[PDB]
């Protein structure tokens, strides 16, 4: 009106998206022998 | 006079072990010398060197019966009649 017309603008930034994701460990496994003693 | 007997590990592990028992031999070589000694040595040693949980047994006449891990198990003869083994859990 009296400042001039202003300009529009537009600007938007960089969104990664959320993923959900779930792993897993296990417990190592043993061994359990027995033996006797030579001679 | 290392005479295997019985065999699990791999044969690094297995000329580090001759290592050390002859080591402990040396350690205690003398007619006052007691097995219980070099055991300790042995088992501290493979201890700092390969990690905890092992177990050296030295005898010439017995019986044992334990658990062990796998590759982780030796059990050997000596010309001077030392019945060595050792093992890991």
């Known amino acids: 009106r009296n400042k001039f017309n202003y300009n529009t603008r537009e600007c938007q930034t960089i969104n990664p998206s959320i993923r959900e994701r779930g792993v897993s460990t296990e417990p190592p496994p043993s061994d359990t022998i027995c033996g006797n003693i030579t001679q | 006079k290392a005479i295997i ?4 590990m791999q044969g690094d592990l297995l ?16 007619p006052v010398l007691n097995i219980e ?9 493979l201890d700092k060197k390969f990690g905890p949980t092992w177990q050296c047994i030295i005898g ?9 891990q ?3 198990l030796l ?15």
Do not use: P, R
């Open chain 2, 70 to 72: 796998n590759n982780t």
């Open chain 2, 75 to 89: 059990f050997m003869f000596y010309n001077g009649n030392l019945a060595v083994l050792i093992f890991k859990s």
């Open chain 2, 15 to 30: 000329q580090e072990a001759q290592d050390v028992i002859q080591s402990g031999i040396e350690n205690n070589s003398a």
């Open chain 2, 5 to 8: 007997n019985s065999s699990d």
């Open chain 2, 60 to 68: 010439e006449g017995y019986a044992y019966d334990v658990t062990v």
């Open chain 2, 37 to 45: 000694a070099a055991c300790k040595y042995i088992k501290e040693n």
